Amino acid sequence: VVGGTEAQRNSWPSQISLQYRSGSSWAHTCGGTLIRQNWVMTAAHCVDRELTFRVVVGEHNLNQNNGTEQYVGVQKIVVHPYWNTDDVAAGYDIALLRLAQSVTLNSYVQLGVLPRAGTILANNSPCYITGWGLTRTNGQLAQTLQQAYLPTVDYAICSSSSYWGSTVKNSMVCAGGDGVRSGCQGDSGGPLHCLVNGQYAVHGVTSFVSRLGCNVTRKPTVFTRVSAYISWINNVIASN
Ligand SMILES: *C(=O)[C@@H](CC)[C@@H](CNS(=O)(=O)c1ccc(C)cc1)C(=O)O
Numbered sequence: 001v002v003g004g005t006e007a008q009r010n011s012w013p014s015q016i017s018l019q020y021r022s023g024s025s026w027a028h029t030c031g032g033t034l035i036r037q038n039w040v041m042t043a044a045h046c047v048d049r050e051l052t053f054r055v056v057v058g059e060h061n062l063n064q065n066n067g068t069e070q071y072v073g074v075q076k077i078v079v080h081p082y083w084n085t086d087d088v089a090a091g092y093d094i095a096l097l098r099l100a101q102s103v104t105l106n107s108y109v110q111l112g113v114l115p116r117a118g119t120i121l122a123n124n125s126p127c128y129i130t131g132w133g134l135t136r137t138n139g140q141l142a143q144t145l146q147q148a149y150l151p152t153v154d155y156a157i158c159s160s161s162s163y164w165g166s167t168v169k170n171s172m173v174c175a176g177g178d179g180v181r182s183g184c185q186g187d188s189g190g191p192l193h194c195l196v197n198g199q200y201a202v203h204g205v206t207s208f209v210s211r212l213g214c215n216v217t218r219k220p221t222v223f224t225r226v227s228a229y230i231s232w233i234n235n236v237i238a239s240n
């Protein structure tokens with residue numbers, strides 16, 4: 001997250017860290033959202049590589065013991081059947097991870113609230129992106145979980161030629177584009193939390209940023225629209 005602030009450790013209890021085995025250690029690669037005690041929602045592009053993955057819930061500082069983390073293996077990966085590695089702009093960037101163990105809930109570990117199916121945010125709706133991704137374009141991951149305010153940019157505006165043009169679809173949410181604040185590599189898969197009717201709900205799964213850089217004016221960070229996939233999500237959780 002470029003232009004972010006350190007989140008309080010109990011602000012976003014549904015955020016997880018998706019990590020892959022690297023030698024004798026584990027490395028963070030993407031965010032994700034805890035949606036069942038044994039299920040995490042993340043981006044399909046985060047699990048394109050044939051790596052060993054684990055999820056960390058109740059994580060705050062990647063490089064220090066926080067005293068609140070639970071570490072669980074990934075037992076099953078279900079990517080949207082329409083996802084295509086070669087066309088992120090086509091959409092379907094979403095995947096569900098079944099955890100090997102059910103995690104325990106507490107103030108640092110909670111299920112993300114999802115929007116009702118079909119919900120679309122009015123332009124300029126208040127949202128926060130969270131994650132441990134690069135703090136600058138071509139930078140390094142954050143140690144502590146970051147958050148940045150990124151107001152939505154509606155479809156008509158985000159799909160206009162000055163913004164993302166045809167690359168953005170109606171199954172996606174755009175947010176930000178101020179040139180200061182944005183998602184960045186390693187934030188993918190994580191949540192976009194938007195305040196609706198007094199409750200924060202996860203409306204987006206972080207998907208991509210411009211090839212030009214993370215914080216690029218009029219290239220808001222783009223997210224899979226969670227409210228477009230509610231039936232798919234329920235179908236996968238029900239069938240496995
Ligand atoms: C997500 O982090 C996104 C920026 C918000 C990235 C793509 N996701 S990633 O950095 O996890 C991804 C890229 C490519 C590979 C091979 C592995 C990891 C983006 O650049 O748009």
Ligand SMILES: [Ca+2]
Pocket residue numbers: 059060061062063064065066067069
């Ligand atoms: Ca930690």
